[PDB]
Amino acid sequence: SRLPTLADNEIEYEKQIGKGGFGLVHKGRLVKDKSVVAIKSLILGDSEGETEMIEKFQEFQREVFIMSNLNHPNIVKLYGLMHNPPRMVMEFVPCGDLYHRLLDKAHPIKWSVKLRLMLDIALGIEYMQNQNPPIVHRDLRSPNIFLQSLDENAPVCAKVADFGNFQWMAPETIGAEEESYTEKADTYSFAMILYTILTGEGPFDEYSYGKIKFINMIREEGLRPTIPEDCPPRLRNVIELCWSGDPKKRPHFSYIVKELSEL
């Protein structure tokens, strides 16, 4: 739908954040709104294969298409597009990502904030699955959860970002033709996000197997991370149901949100 265009006179540049899949990431600011932005550029890789340049362009376009229709506080917003070099202008999220925050073991996130993070992400995914047709992220993991604030009283704590690691992926998606990724695949990945918030640990990090065996254990033997004994029964049930081997047993997000709110 509606995606405004912005020129260089409308954008102020600052620093270079990093390298992405199709180009560069930059920290900036709108001169109109004075609000801070993250800018993702498209760069065509120098030879890199002929077919590599095509998929780079098509991934950039896919991200534009997906982000331009999503409008929710728990999902990173696309403000606009730029042309000189093609660019996406997205809101900047100031407190890093969930993956890196959880690595700080000396400073555990307190329980009330953990619940806010769980609910925030659930709300974002609920919105995605309520679209027509339902939006599927297809790369849900803790590095793609951006942290707005760790204040338990903030309007928004977490945002879903970087719309698309077998330990995050639903069993029916592993080594499968991509169009087997239903919305229920995101629901499985969400269970693993809930697990990582709860424990501060990487999902499946308690196990070590060769890749073929690992996948077989997940797919055929229902191997899942161990939920701690002190986990609240209602949270345990949500996690367990969300990572069901059978995708149709993974709950609708209205149920997930209700259950999490009662924690």
UniProtKB/Swiss-Prot annotation:
Residues at which ATP binds: 17-25, 40
Which residue numbers delimit the Protein kinase domain? 11-263
Say which domain of life the source belongs to: Eukaryota
Q: Could you list the residue ranges forming a coiled coil in this record?
A: none
Identify the catalytic residues: 139 (proton acceptor)
Family the entry assigns: Belongs to the protein kinase superfamily. TKL Ser/Thr protein kinase family. ROCO subfamily.
This protein's name: Probable serine/threonine-protein kinase roco4
- Specify the taxonomic lineage: Eukaryota, Amoebozoa, Evosea, Eumycetozoa, Dictyostelia
**Residue span relative to the full protein:** 1019 to 1292 of 1726
